[PDB]
RNA sequence: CUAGUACCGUGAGGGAAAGCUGAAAAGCACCCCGGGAGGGGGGUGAAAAGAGCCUGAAGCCAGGCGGCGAUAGGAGGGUGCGGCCCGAAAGGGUUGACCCUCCCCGAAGGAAACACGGGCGACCGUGGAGUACGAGGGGAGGUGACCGGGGUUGCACCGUCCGU
RNA sequence: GUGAUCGGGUAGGCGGGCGUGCCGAUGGGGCGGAAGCCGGGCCGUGAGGUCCGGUGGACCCGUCGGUAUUGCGGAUCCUGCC
RNA sequence: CCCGAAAACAGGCGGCCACCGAGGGCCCGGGAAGAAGACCC
């Protein structure tokens, strides 16, 4: 139960992530990793965006929700690191993954969004 | 940091070292099947003069550094592991844990438990 | 089947594949070698028309591998030729065979072409013939083994 | 590539600034080769180039020692002499040379170079003698 | 043990290792250290003090 | 283990090799081809372990894959830089590989242009200047997936095997 | 801490370690797969150790102390196979 | 006078095809040629 975590999340919401970011590793953009992350961020270029639980230490995911918070786009908590790992087809665990340019998960980029905004209220 | 230093000292050594094998090991299916080191002892040996053009011998001077001498590239000191009465007993922030082979499935399913609890490292 | 040999051949599809053996014969590896890379990657009935030729001396095979004190033979390509007539019969039966196997196995027959041909050496059966000034030596027979996949095209 | 013409030349140093530029990298034309000097008296050049020709393997002269007796083939083989010709750098420096007796129409009509290092302007002494010469006696077309 | 066999030897200018063998086919070599069933070049003995 | 046996010598005498299916024979019913030994399908079995039977290594042979391959010279290797191929785990790595640029310190060492003058001259002296740089040790950033390792081979240099 | 006044070596002499089989003790593993075999990763100056995958189908290792038919490229070596 | 386009600047000319098919080999009857191959009609 780290700092940078704000609430506790359902099961099909993150799952759904997971499945939203390799639908998208299928065609479009998709950066890896707490700097690029960032970055796309900043530069706004950023649209969706997973992050994971067990994230230790937290001192590399913790200034992120203060990024996230004024972007104000849905981030989604995944609770393993392996599984982002597979999702975006690598064999190192991940933290963090931003997804840009969805094809064939438009559907369900608005649905998690929709979701996400629910529990947001 | 010191500790890195020579680590990286290491590595360069044991990148540039050779390996230190006998004679003719390439000529003979009996030395190519078991490639290990052997001194040569001849007469007129040429690896035993030391010429140039020859492969080398070892010697005391390609030994690593005494402080990071027999460590992991994690850095980590290894610790043989065939239990969890030896899985305790291991400080987690100088020591790793390696289980032995011979250990089956239903042991190394609890060994592997109690690891992540107590926060141990596990290299398999 | 039997089980007491297998092949060499890797990542054989029953269902579009047919096997056939010949064990424990009584001719030589070399020829057989020297036949097999020419049948090799051809269709069945070209190599039975091939076969046919051989055997009556109509068509040489050339050798490449074994060749000493061999004589050149007519046309272009030649170079040391042979006419091997025990190896040509026993390739035919087990060709015979094999085309047996498609068609019972369901696969048309005319469609057929030969992706693997392979001969491996046998057991040694030793003997002795008598010399001059005491001795005897070996006089001894290398026998053969011969193995032929054939897969059906579409 | 470069063209070069010797005329009124010296073969070694030509030659030793030649197989430096080929090592270097360069293509190189040698034009007029009959007319570059050798430096000496007659008798003593004749008789070298003599007992060069009648060198020969005594068991097969299809090997052998395959000296020459024209002019632009004795340019190219003292240019090689000074290359390493057991070797595969040697061997594409040395295909990257070409001689000629005279100027051909090719050729014609461009302009040359030449190597102040040689030349008969250094001598002091009336003692030369030409590559033609030298192949007329050993009995060479042009 | 290993010494139970009879032999003779070859000698020089066969071709041949000047070791010891027996007469009748197949001939094979006897009784000495390096051979296969030949007598072994120091064995353990009773003699010996344990105590 | 059907061994002082087979076998050798006129004879007195000499003298071998050779262990192991499976818990249970449940030791392959039946079909197609073949003169046949046999091959192919199907079946038993926890597993073919198929009697030519526990495990089943090397040398040897065939085929498939990868690399080289008909102008070329050394005992079949060493040092360095490359090209093609494999690369899951046990090695590192998205808590960021390789490469890139920026700064600070900096051993032993250490320029040049250029300005004045000396020498017939190659060049030297004073200044520039102990500057620019310099093995390595630290730090700040961008880029975003390979690196190390292995197989073979090209180039340049070096290299007349082993025991006595 | 000292070493400008240590760092080549045949015959030879001295010191420490790796590995193989059996005993007395001690501590462990194994049909959820032992030994052995194949190909690979890591540590080690090195002798060598250990892990991954596969094959295999019942036994094996560590530390302490003792013991030994205790380490091979050669003998115109022996046996078997090619 | 004899050999001689593998002369690594690995040639020159004329013509025929290619971008179904020009040419060639096997095969048949023979020798002026011949250890097999090649050569000639």
Same mark, same amino acid.
């Given at each position: 139960?780290?700092?940078?975590?704000?609430?506790?999340?359902?099961?099909?919401?993150?799952?759904?992530?997971?499945?939203?970011?390799?639908?998208?590793?299928?065609?479009?953009?998709?950066?890896?990793?707490?700097?690029?992350?960032?970055?796309?961020?900043?530069?706004?270029?950023?649209?969706?965006? @997973? @992050?994971?639980?067990?994230?230790?230490?937290?001192?590399?995911?913790?200034?992120?929700?203060?990024?996230?918070?004024?972007?104000? @786009?849905?981030?989604?908590?995944?609770?393993?690191?392996?599984?982002?790992?597979?999702?975006?087809?690598?064999?190192?665990?991940?933290?963090?993954?931003? @997804? /840009?340019?969805?094809?064939?998960?438009?559907?369900?980029?608005?649905? /998690?969004?929709?979701?996400?905004?629910?529990?947001?209220? | 940091?010191?500790?890195?230093?020579?680590?990286?000292?290491?590595?360069?050594?044991?990148?540039?070292?050779?390996?230190?094998?006998?004679?003719?090991?390439?000529?003979?299916?009996?030395?190519?099947?078991?490639?290990?080191?052997?001194?040569?002892?001849?007469?007129?040996?040429?690896?035993?003069?030391?010429?140039?053009?020859? &492969?080398?011998? &070892?010697?005391?001077?390609?030994?690593?550094?005494?402080?990071?001498?027999?460590?992991?590239?994690?850095?980590?000191?290894?610790?043989?592991?065939?239990?969890?009465?030896?899985?305790?007993?291991?400080? &987690?922030?100088?020591?790793?844990?390696?289980?032995?082979?011979?250990?089956?499935?239903?042991?190394?399913?609890?060994?592997?438990?109690?690891?992540?609890?107590?926060?141990?490292?596990?290299?398999? | 089947?039997?089980? $007491?040999?297998?092949?060499?051949?890797?990542?054989?599809?029953?269902? $579009?594949?047919?096997?056939?053996?010949?064990?424990?014969?009584?001719?030589?590896?070399?020829?057989?070698?020297?036949?097999?890379?020419?049948? $090799?990657?051809?269709?069945?009935?070209?190599?039975?028309?091939?076969?046919?030729?051989?055997?009556?001396?109509?068509?040489?095979?050339?050798?490449?591998?074994?060749?000493?004190?061999?004589?050149?033979?007519?046309?272009?390509?030649?170079?040391?030729?042979?006419?091997?007539?025990?190896?040509?019969?026993?390739?035919?039966?087990?060709?015979?065979?094999?085309?047996?196997?498609?068609?019972?196995?369901?696969?048309?027959?005319?469609?057929?072409?030969?992706?693997?041909?392979?001969?491996?050496?046998?057991?040694?059966?030793?003997?002795?013939?008598?010399?001059?000034?005491?001795?005897?030596?070996?006089?001894?027979?290398?026998?053969?083994?011969?193995?032929?996949?054939?897969?059906?095209?579409? | 590539?470069?063209?070069?013409?010797?005329?009124?030349?010296?073969?070694?140093?030509?030659?030793?600034?030649?197989?430096?530029?080929?090592?270097?990298?360069?293509?190189?034309?040698?034009?007029?080769?009959?007319?570059?000097?050798?430096?000496?008296?007659?008798?003593?050049?004749?008789?070298? %180039?003599?007992?060069?020709?009648?060198?020969?393997?005594?068991?097969?002269?299809?090997?052998?020692?395959?000296?020459?007796?024209?002019?632009?083939?004795?340019?190219?083989?003292?240019?090689?002499?000074?290359?390493?010709?057991?070797?595969?750098?040697?061997?594409?420096?040395?295909?990257?040379?070409?001689? %000629?007796?005279?100027?051909?129409?090719?050729?014609?009509?461009?302009?040359?170079?030449?190597?102040?290092?040689?030349?008969?302007?250094?001598?002091?002494?009336?003692?030369?003698?030409?590559?033609?010469?030298?192949?007329?006696?050993?009995?060479?077309?042009? | 043990?290993?010494?139970?066999?009879?032999?003779?030897?070859?000698?020089?200018?066969?071709?041949?290792?000047?070791?010891?063998?027996?007469?009748?086919?197949?001939?094979?070599?006897?009784?000495?250290?390096?051979?296969?069933?030949?007598?072994?070049?120091?064995?353990?003995?009773?003699?010996?003090?344990?105590?």
């Amino acid at each position: 139960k780290p700092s940078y975590v704000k609430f506790e999340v359902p099961q099909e919401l993150a799952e759904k992530a997971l499945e939203a970011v390799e639908i998208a590793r299928d065609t479009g953009r998709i950066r890896k990793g707490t700097n690029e992350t960032t970055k796309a961020v900043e530069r706004g270029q950023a649209k969706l965006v @997973i @992050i994971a639980e067990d994230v230790d230490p937290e001192e590399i995911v913790a200034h992120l929700p203060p990024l996230c918070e004024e972007k104000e @786009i849905p981030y989604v908590y995944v609770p393993s690191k392996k599984e982002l790992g597979a999702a975006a087809g690598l064999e190192v665990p991940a933290a963090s993954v931003a @997804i /840009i340019e969805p094809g064939k998960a438009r559907e369900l980029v608005e649905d /998690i969004a929709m979701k996400v905004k629910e529990l947001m209220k | 940091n010191e500790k890195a230093r020579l680590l990286r000292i290491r590595a360069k050594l044991k990148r540039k070292k050779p390996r230190f094998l006998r004679q003719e090991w390439w000529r003979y299916p009996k030395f190519k099947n078991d490639p290990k080191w052997r001194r040569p002892k001849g007469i007129d040996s040429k690896m035993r003069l030391k010429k140039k053009g020859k &492969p080398r011998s &070892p010697s005391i001077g390609w030994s690593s550094p005494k402080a990071v001498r027999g460590l992991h590239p994690s850095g980590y000191e290894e610790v043989l592991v065939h239990n969890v009465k030896e899985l305790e007993a291991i400080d &987690p922030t100088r020591q790793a844990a390696r289980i032995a082979g011979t250990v089956g499935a239903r042991k190394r399913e609890m060994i592997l438990a109690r690891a992540k609890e107590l926060g141990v490292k596990v290299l398999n | 089947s039997r089980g $007491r040999f297998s092949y060499s051949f890797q990542n054989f599809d029953p269902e $579009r594949m047919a096997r056939a053996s010949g064990r424990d014969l009584r001719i030589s590896p070399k020829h057989s070698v020297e036949l097999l890379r020419e049948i $090799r990657g051809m269709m069945l009935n070209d190599a039975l028309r091939y076969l046919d030729d051989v055997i009556a001396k109509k068509r040489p095979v050339p050798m490449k591998r074994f060749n000493d004190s061999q004589g050149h033979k007519p046309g272009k390509g030649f170079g040391p030729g042979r006419y091997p007539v025990k190896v040509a019969k026993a390739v035919k039966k087990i060709l015979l065979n094999a085309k047996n196997n498609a068609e019972q196995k369901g696969l048309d027959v005319d469609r057929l072409k030969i992706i693997h041909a392979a001969a491996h050496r046998g057991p040694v059966l030793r003997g002795y013939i008598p010399r001059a000034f005491g001795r005897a030596t070996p006089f001894n027979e290398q026998t053969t083994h011969i193995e032929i996949v054939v897969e059906e095209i579409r | 590539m470069r063209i070069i013409n010797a005329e009124g030349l010296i073969l070694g140093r030509l030659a030793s600034k030649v197989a430096k530029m080929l090592l270097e990298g360069e293509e190189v034309v040698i034009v007029n080769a009959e007319k570059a000097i050798i430096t000496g008296n007659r008798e003593d050049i004749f008789a070298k %180039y003599k007992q060069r020709t009648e060198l020969r393997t005594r068991t097969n002269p299809r090997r052998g020692p395959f000296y020459p007796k024209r002019s632009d083939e004795i340019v190219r083989r003292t240019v090689r002499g000074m290359l390493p010709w057991k070797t595969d750098r040697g061997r594409k420096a040395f295909k990257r040379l070409k001689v %000629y007796v005279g100027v051909p129409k090719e050729f014609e009509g461009k302009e040359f170079e030449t190597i102040s290092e040689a030349h008969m302007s250094r001598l002091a002494t009336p003692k030369y003698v030409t590559v033609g010469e030298v192949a007329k006696f050993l009995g060479g077309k042009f | 043990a290993g010494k139970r066999r009879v032999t003779e030897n070859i000698g020089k200018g066969h071709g041949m290792a000047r070791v010891e063998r027996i007469k009748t086919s197949p001939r094979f070599a006897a009784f000495v250290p390096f051979a296969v069933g030949g007598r072994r070049t120091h064995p353990p003995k009773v003699e010996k003090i344990i105590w």
